[PDB]
Amino acid sequence: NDLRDFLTLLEQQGELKRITLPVDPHLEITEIADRTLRAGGPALLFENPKGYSMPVLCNLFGTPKRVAMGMGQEDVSALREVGKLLAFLKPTKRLRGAPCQQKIVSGDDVDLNRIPIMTCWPEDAAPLITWGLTVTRGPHKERQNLGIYRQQLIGKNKLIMRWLSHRGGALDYQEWCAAHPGERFPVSVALGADPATILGAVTPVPDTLSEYAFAGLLRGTKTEVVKCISNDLEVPASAEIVLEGYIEQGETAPEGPYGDHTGYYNEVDSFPVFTVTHITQREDAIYHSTYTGRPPDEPAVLGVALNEVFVPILQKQFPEIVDFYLPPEGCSYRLAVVTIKKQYAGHAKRVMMGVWSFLRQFMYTKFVIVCDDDVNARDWNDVIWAITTRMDPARDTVLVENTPIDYLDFASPVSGLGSKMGLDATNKWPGETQREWGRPIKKDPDVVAHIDAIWDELAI
Amino acid sequence: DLRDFLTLLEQQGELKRITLPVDPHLEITEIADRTLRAGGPALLFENPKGYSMPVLCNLFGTPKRVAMGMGQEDVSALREVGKPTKRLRGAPCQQKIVSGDDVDLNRIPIMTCWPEDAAPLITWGLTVTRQNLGIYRQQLIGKNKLIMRWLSHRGGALDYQEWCAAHPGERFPVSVALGADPATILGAVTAGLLRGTKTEVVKCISNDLEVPASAEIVLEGYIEQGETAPEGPYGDHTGYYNEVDSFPVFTVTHITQREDAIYHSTYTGRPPDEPAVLGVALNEVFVPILQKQFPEIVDFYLPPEGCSYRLAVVTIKKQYAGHAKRVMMGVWSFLRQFMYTKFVIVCDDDVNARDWNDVIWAITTRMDPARDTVLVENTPIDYLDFASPVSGLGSKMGLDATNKWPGETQREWGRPIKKDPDVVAHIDAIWDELAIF
């Protein structure tokens, strides 16, 4: 039901390790988690962080298996069904009491320095909160947005709220300033909610229902919430820790530099300040954290699982698509491989244009490789094979200039604007070539199946 | 010798004996393909369906095992190559003999590699014809007939062409050796002293040609002048079937073998395969020749998955704006072996050329595709590459994935995240006691 249930389950299955040695939240936890993630190991619970009593949980979603379990299922394949659900969509139980409100502190007594907030990389400006569910409401509307923004520590009761312009929290704030000049903007942040509510924030959800409602569908049951002490926002009742407060209009601060998911430092830049009035927590509270850096990291593993959700949405629109994959090594979204059952000359070009335009998540995707269905999109041995035996580079490469690009991608010529490349690695049909194309080597499916059957008894 | 080599590999967990019945028709290839693709061991099939002779394959399926076969622990010593034989009288390879009507090639577990291959095919024969050594594929067309597929430029074909001109009508003597010791096998690539001590050989029973004494099996015979046959189709190292074509016939008069002989085999197909892994190890010879001409080059690698020569990754210590372009042009013009290389990626020295995780990282964080991609049209291409628009002629692509300097960009380029060496060392020290697994 809640996060602790999830952790005891993981522990029985050898998917959680408790660590009793002293480990510093300054740089050391990150190093340990990075080595662990890179070898597919368990989630980690640091019971003795140097200089703090609250234990630190991280690497929670570091294998795609653990992502699936957090949505109820046993294997990664079942994410495709959550996909069909999302296509289909064009409730919440309020409690009076709640574990997340067992211990309270406010006003002058707020001291964020009692929490083991991590510092991830050697040149990061300061400790940084990374797994907060930020809850906001706009002025014209009842819907509550949930968002995951990084928050730098600048004082005993001050954090910076780094939301980028396009995201729901930033839009709610921008409207609030316009509709209520001068008024404090109410905000709350929840740390350590249950896995379904966490995974629901991460997933894109059409406006026809709320974010808490979706998470209720992944979980058998309705999402339980509780009203905040100092505002009318609703937060998950079993949260381990909750921060309540406001944004004072026109108060801002320099943020960063911080290491990012691309493997480089973002340079310094201004964002609004979040003043914390209340810290509420559970009785033996656990602090939930993570880090971004050179891929693969936990976010990148989440993004791989989350791309299985989208395969079906794509297929419904383009039934020619057999598989669709974004390697984590390409910073999760910058490169895609697509395999199709080709039906006509030029077909690959319509598929490129589809990837670059149908879903917003792929709007900034710089490289797209298209292949036939005799290629396993998830294996570089096949993908390189196809590129080097089915392309003439000048004939089969598509370039498009002056297209939208992430403003923090320093590799484009001007901020926000750059080019894209599609590679048509499909077999060329008459009209596309005047040569006799080669007949590929196909395996015998009967021999393949016989070897699957004796594979274990061969014991190699 | 070969058996010494195999017992060494076995004690180091680099050889699996397999006792289950398995067919040389298609099944061995499937098993070897899966094992190679996961970096597993060499394989010795002790019980091949319908044969007594065991089948050895995937011998050189990791570059480590190539190194061990040349004596040492690293492939490094090939970079120094970058910068006479002993005749025995008597030999294990001649312990058992068969000739004339008794020659029956169907007693040998010759593999059929892919479903539409014309027939069983011999793939690791050392063909002997000064003596030239060559590795030519040989299709089985009868009890004592094989097709000898050598293309015109190669040493065996040239010897034969001269023989027909100098001795009209005379039978051409030929021999083929299977399962020689690892050094003579690796030796190739236009005599090789990887071993350092001289190679041991033995005269053939029915001709004056010399073959390795520690061969498991030897075929002796001749080419009857003007006798030819349709060959193939066969699956090849590109991953496609080559179409049918005519080549000379090799009549086998004698089969000589060792007692308890082992049949050494392999397969070519969609890369990577064993030949491709050999070609990667063997390319290390050229790194030094490139470096002497372009000392900026730190590494230079051609993945097997690109059919051994069609794609190259190069890492450099960049010294000026535009530097990557000169290096591209160098790869495409300095050595003839890289004349047909279609794709070239250039990266900085913080990248391991041999790891796709690094190479994709660089491409997706240091390139604007239109600015940084170089296309050149109407350049020389292999005439058998059906993907070019016209036979013998096609385009090439260079990708400049280096960090961009002032002039190449007007933006603030990213500072990469470096780790704290003191934190790394402390975690090495407590790693075992942390006990995560």
CSV table of N, CA and C in Angstrom, one decimal, chain B residues 230-313:
chain,number,residue,atom,x,y,z
B,230,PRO,N,29.4,-25.0,-60.9
B,230,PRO,CA,28.6,-24.0,-60.1
B,230,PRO,C,28.8,-24.1,-58.6
B,231,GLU,N,29.1,-22.9,-58.0
B,231,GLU,CA,29.4,-22.8,-56.6
B,231,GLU,C,28.3,-21.9,-55.9
B,232,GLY,N,27.7,-22.4,-54.9
B,232,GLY,CA,26.9,-21.5,-54.0
B,232,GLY,C,25.5,-21.7,-54.6
B,233,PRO,N,24.6,-20.8,-54.2
B,233,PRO,CA,24.8,-19.6,-53.3
B,233,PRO,C,25.2,-20.1,-51.9
B,234,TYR,N,26.0,-19.2,-51.2
B,234,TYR,CA,26.4,-19.3,-49.8
B,234,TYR,C,26.2,-18.0,-49.1
B,235,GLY,N,25.8,-18.1,-47.8
B,235,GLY,CA,25.8,-16.9,-46.9
B,235,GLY,C,27.3,-16.5,-46.6
B,236,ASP,N,27.5,-15.2,-46.6
B,236,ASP,CA,28.8,-14.6,-46.4
B,236,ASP,C,29.0,-13.6,-45.3
B,237,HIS,N,30.2,-13.0,-45.2
B,237,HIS,CA,30.5,-12.2,-44.0
B,237,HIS,C,29.7,-10.8,-44.0
B,238,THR,N,29.1,-10.5,-45.1
B,238,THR,CA,28.2,-9.3,-45.2
B,238,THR,C,26.8,-9.6,-44.6
B,239,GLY,N,26.4,-10.8,-44.4
B,239,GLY,CA,25.0,-11.2,-44.0
B,239,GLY,C,24.1,-11.4,-45.1
B,240,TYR,N,24.6,-11.6,-46.3
B,240,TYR,CA,23.7,-11.9,-47.5
B,240,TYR,C,24.2,-13.1,-48.3
B,241,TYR,N,23.3,-13.7,-49.1
B,241,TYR,CA,23.7,-14.8,-49.9
B,241,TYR,C,24.4,-14.2,-51.2
B,242,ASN,N,25.6,-14.7,-51.5
B,242,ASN,CA,26.2,-14.4,-52.8
B,242,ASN,C,25.5,-15.3,-53.9
B,243,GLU,N,25.3,-14.8,-55.1
B,243,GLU,CA,24.7,-15.6,-56.1
B,243,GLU,C,25.6,-16.6,-56.8
B,244,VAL,N,25.1,-17.6,-57.5
B,244,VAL,CA,25.9,-18.8,-58.0
B,244,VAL,C,26.9,-18.3,-59.1
B,245,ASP,N,28.0,-19.0,-59.1
B,245,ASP,CA,29.1,-18.7,-60.0
B,245,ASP,C,30.1,-19.9,-60.2
B,246,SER,N,30.8,-20.0,-61.3
B,246,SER,CA,31.7,-21.1,-61.6
B,246,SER,C,33.2,-21.1,-61.1
B,247,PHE,N,33.7,-22.2,-60.5
B,247,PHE,CA,35.1,-22.2,-60.0
B,247,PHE,C,35.7,-23.6,-60.2
B,248,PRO,N,37.0,-23.8,-60.2
B,248,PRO,CA,37.6,-25.1,-60.5
B,248,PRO,C,37.3,-26.2,-59.5
B,249,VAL,N,37.4,-27.4,-60.0
B,249,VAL,CA,37.1,-28.6,-59.1
B,249,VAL,C,38.4,-29.2,-58.6
B,250,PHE,N,38.4,-29.6,-57.3
B,250,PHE,CA,39.6,-30.2,-56.6
B,250,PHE,C,39.2,-31.7,-56.4
B,251,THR,N,39.9,-32.6,-57.1
B,251,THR,CA,39.7,-34.0,-56.9
B,251,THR,C,40.6,-34.5,-55.8
B,252,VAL,N,40.0,-35.2,-54.8
B,252,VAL,CA,40.8,-35.7,-53.6
B,252,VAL,C,41.2,-37.1,-53.8
B,253,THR,N,42.5,-37.4,-53.9
B,253,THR,CA,43.1,-38.7,-54.0
B,253,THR,C,43.5,-39.4,-52.7
B,254,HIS,N,43.9,-38.6,-51.7
B,254,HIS,CA,44.3,-39.1,-50.4
B,254,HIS,C,43.7,-38.2,-49.2
B,255,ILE,N,43.3,-38.9,-48.2
B,255,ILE,CA,43.0,-38.3,-46.9
B,255,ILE,C,43.8,-38.9,-45.8
B,256,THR,N,44.6,-38.1,-45.2
B,256,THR,CA,45.6,-38.4,-44.2
B,256,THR,C,45.1,-37.8,-42.9
B,257,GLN,N,45.1,-38.5,-41.8
B,257,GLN,CA,44.7,-37.9,-40.5
B,257,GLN,C,45.4,-38.5,-39.3
B,258,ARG,N,45.2,-37.8,-38.2
B,258,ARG,CA,45.7,-38.1,-36.9
B,258,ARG,C,44.8,-39.2,-36.3
B,259,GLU,N,45.2,-39.9,-35.3
B,259,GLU,CA,44.4,-40.8,-34.6
B,259,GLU,C,43.5,-39.9,-33.7
B,260,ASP,N,42.3,-40.3,-33.5
B,260,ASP,CA,41.3,-39.6,-32.7
B,260,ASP,C,41.2,-38.1,-33.2
B,261,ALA,N,41.2,-37.9,-34.5
B,261,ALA,CA,41.3,-36.6,-35.1
B,261,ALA,C,40.1,-35.7,-34.8
B,262,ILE,N,40.3,-34.4,-34.7
B,262,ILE,CA,39.3,-33.4,-34.4
B,262,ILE,C,39.1,-32.6,-35.7
B,263,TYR,N,37.8,-32.3,-36.0
B,263,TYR,CA,37.6,-31.5,-37.2
B,263,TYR,C,37.3,-30.0,-36.8
B,264,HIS,N,38.2,-29.1,-37.3
B,264,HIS,CA,38.2,-27.7,-37.0
B,264,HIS,C,37.4,-26.8,-38.1
B,265,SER,N,36.4,-26.1,-37.6
B,265,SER,CA,35.4,-25.5,-38.5
B,265,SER,C,35.0,-24.1,-38.0
B,266,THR,N,34.3,-23.4,-38.8
B,266,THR,CA,33.7,-22.1,-38.5
B,266,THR,C,32.6,-21.7,-39.5
B,267,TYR,N,32.2,-20.5,-39.5
B,267,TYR,CA,31.1,-20.1,-40.3
B,267,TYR,C,31.3,-18.5,-40.5
B,268,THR,N,30.8,-18.0,-41.7
B,268,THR,CA,30.6,-16.6,-41.9
B,268,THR,C,29.2,-16.3,-42.0
B,269,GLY,N,28.8,-15.2,-41.4
B,269,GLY,CA,27.4,-14.6,-41.6
B,269,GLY,C,27.3,-13.2,-41.2
B,270,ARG,N,26.1,-12.8,-40.9
B,270,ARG,CA,25.9,-11.5,-40.3
B,270,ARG,C,26.9,-11.2,-39.2
B,271,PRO,N,27.6,-10.1,-39.2
B,271,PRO,CA,28.6,-9.9,-38.2
B,271,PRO,C,28.0,-9.5,-36.9
B,272,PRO,N,28.7,-9.8,-35.8
B,272,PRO,CA,30.0,-10.4,-35.7
B,272,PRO,C,30.1,-11.9,-35.8
B,273,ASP,N,31.1,-12.4,-36.5
B,273,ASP,CA,31.4,-13.8,-36.5
B,273,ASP,C,32.9,-13.9,-36.2
B,274,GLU,N,33.4,-15.2,-36.1
B,274,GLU,CA,34.8,-15.4,-35.8
B,274,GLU,C,35.8,-14.7,-36.7
B,275,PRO,N,35.7,-14.8,-38.0
B,275,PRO,CA,36.5,-14.1,-39.0
B,275,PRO,C,36.6,-12.6,-38.7
B,276,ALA,N,35.5,-12.0,-38.4
B,276,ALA,CA,35.4,-10.6,-38.0
B,276,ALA,C,36.2,-10.3,-36.7
B,277,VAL,N,36.1,-11.2,-35.7
B,277,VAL,CA,36.9,-11.0,-34.5
B,277,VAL,C,38.4,-11.1,-34.7
B,278,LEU,N,38.8,-12.1,-35.6
B,278,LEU,CA,40.1,-12.1,-36.1
B,278,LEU,C,40.6,-10.8,-36.8
B,279,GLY,N,39.8,-10.3,-37.6
B,279,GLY,CA,40.2,-9.1,-38.4
B,279,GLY,C,40.3,-7.8,-37.5
B,280,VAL,N,39.7,-7.8,-36.3
B,280,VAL,CA,39.8,-6.7,-35.4
B,280,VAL,C,41.1,-6.8,-34.7
B,281,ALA,N,41.4,-8.0,-34.2
B,281,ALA,CA,42.7,-8.2,-33.6
B,281,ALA,C,43.8,-7.9,-34.6
B,282,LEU,N,43.7,-8.4,-35.8
B,282,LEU,CA,44.7,-8.2,-36.8
B,282,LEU,C,44.9,-6.8,-37.3
B,283,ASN,N,43.9,-5.9,-37.2
B,283,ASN,CA,44.0,-4.5,-37.6
B,283,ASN,C,45.0,-3.7,-36.7
B,284,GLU,N,45.2,-4.1,-35.5
B,284,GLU,CA,46.2,-3.4,-34.6
B,284,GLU,C,47.6,-3.2,-35.2
B,285,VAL,N,47.9,-4.0,-36.2
B,285,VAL,CA,49.1,-3.8,-37.0
B,285,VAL,C,49.3,-2.4,-37.6
B,286,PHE,N,48.1,-1.9,-38.0
B,286,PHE,CA,48.1,-0.6,-38.7
B,286,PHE,C,48.1,0.7,-37.8
B,287,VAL,N,47.5,0.5,-36.6
B,287,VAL,CA,47.5,1.7,-35.7
B,287,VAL,C,48.9,2.5,-35.7
B,288,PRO,N,50.0,1.8,-35.5
B,288,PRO,CA,51.3,2.5,-35.5
B,288,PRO,C,51.7,3.2,-36.8
B,289,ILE,N,51.2,2.6,-37.9
B,289,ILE,CA,51.6,3.2,-39.2
B,289,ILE,C,50.8,4.5,-39.4
B,290,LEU,N,49.6,4.5,-39.0
B,290,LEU,CA,48.8,5.7,-38.9
B,290,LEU,C,49.3,6.8,-38.0
B,291,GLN,N,49.7,6.3,-36.8
B,291,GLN,CA,50.2,7.2,-35.7
B,291,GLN,C,51.5,7.9,-36.1
B,292,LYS,N,52.3,7.3,-36.9
B,292,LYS,CA,53.6,7.9,-37.3
B,292,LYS,C,53.2,9.0,-38.2
B,293,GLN,N,52.2,8.8,-39.1
B,293,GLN,CA,51.9,9.9,-40.0
B,293,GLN,C,51.0,10.9,-39.4
B,294,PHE,N,50.1,10.6,-38.4
B,294,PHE,CA,49.2,11.5,-37.7
B,294,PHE,C,49.4,11.2,-36.2
B,295,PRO,N,50.4,11.8,-35.6
B,295,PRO,CA,50.6,11.5,-34.1
B,295,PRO,C,49.5,12.0,-33.2
B,296,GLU,N,48.6,12.8,-33.7
B,296,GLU,CA,47.4,13.2,-33.0
B,296,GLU,C,46.4,12.0,-32.7
B,297,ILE,N,46.6,10.8,-33.3
B,297,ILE,CA,45.7,9.7,-33.2
B,297,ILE,C,46.0,8.8,-32.0
B,298,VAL,N,45.1,8.7,-31.1
B,298,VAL,CA,45.2,8.0,-29.9
B,298,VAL,C,44.8,6.5,-30.1
B,299,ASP,N,43.6,6.3,-30.7
B,299,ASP,CA,43.1,5.0,-31.1
B,299,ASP,C,42.4,5.0,-32.4
B,300,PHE,N,42.3,3.8,-33.0
B,300,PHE,CA,41.7,3.7,-34.3
B,300,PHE,C,41.1,2.3,-34.5
B,301,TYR,N,39.8,2.1,-34.6
B,301,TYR,CA,39.1,0.9,-34.5
B,301,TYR,C,38.0,0.7,-35.6
B,302,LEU,N,37.9,-0.5,-36.1
B,302,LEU,CA,36.9,-0.9,-37.0
B,302,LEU,C,36.0,-2.0,-36.5
B,303,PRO,N,34.8,-1.7,-36.0
B,303,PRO,CA,34.0,-2.7,-35.4
B,303,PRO,C,33.7,-3.8,-36.3
B,304,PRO,N,33.8,-5.1,-35.8
B,304,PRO,CA,33.3,-6.2,-36.7
B,304,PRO,C,31.9,-6.1,-37.2
B,305,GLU,N,31.0,-5.5,-36.5
B,305,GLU,CA,29.6,-5.4,-36.9
B,305,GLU,C,29.4,-4.6,-38.1
B,306,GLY,N,30.4,-3.9,-38.6
B,306,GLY,CA,30.4,-3.1,-39.8
B,306,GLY,C,31.1,-3.9,-40.9
B,307,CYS,N,30.9,-5.2,-40.9
B,307,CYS,CA,31.6,-6.1,-41.9
B,307,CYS,C,33.1,-5.8,-42.0
B,308,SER,N,33.7,-5.5,-40.8
B,308,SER,CA,35.1,-5.4,-40.6
B,308,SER,C,35.9,-4.2,-41.1
B,309,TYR,N,35.4,-3.5,-42.2
B,309,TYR,CA,36.0,-2.4,-42.9
B,309,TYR,C,35.1,-1.2,-43.2
B,310,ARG,N,33.8,-1.3,-43.1
B,310,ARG,CA,32.9,-0.2,-43.6
B,310,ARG,C,32.7,1.0,-42.6
B,311,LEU,N,33.1,0.9,-41.4
B,311,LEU,CA,33.0,2.0,-40.4
B,311,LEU,C,34.2,2.0,-39.5
B,312,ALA,N,34.7,3.2,-39.2
B,312,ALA,CA,35.8,3.4,-38.4
B,312,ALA,C,35.5,4.5,-37.3
B,313,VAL,N,36.0,4.3,-36.1
B,313,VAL,CA,36.0,5.3,-35.0
B,313,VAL,C,37.5,5.7,-34.7
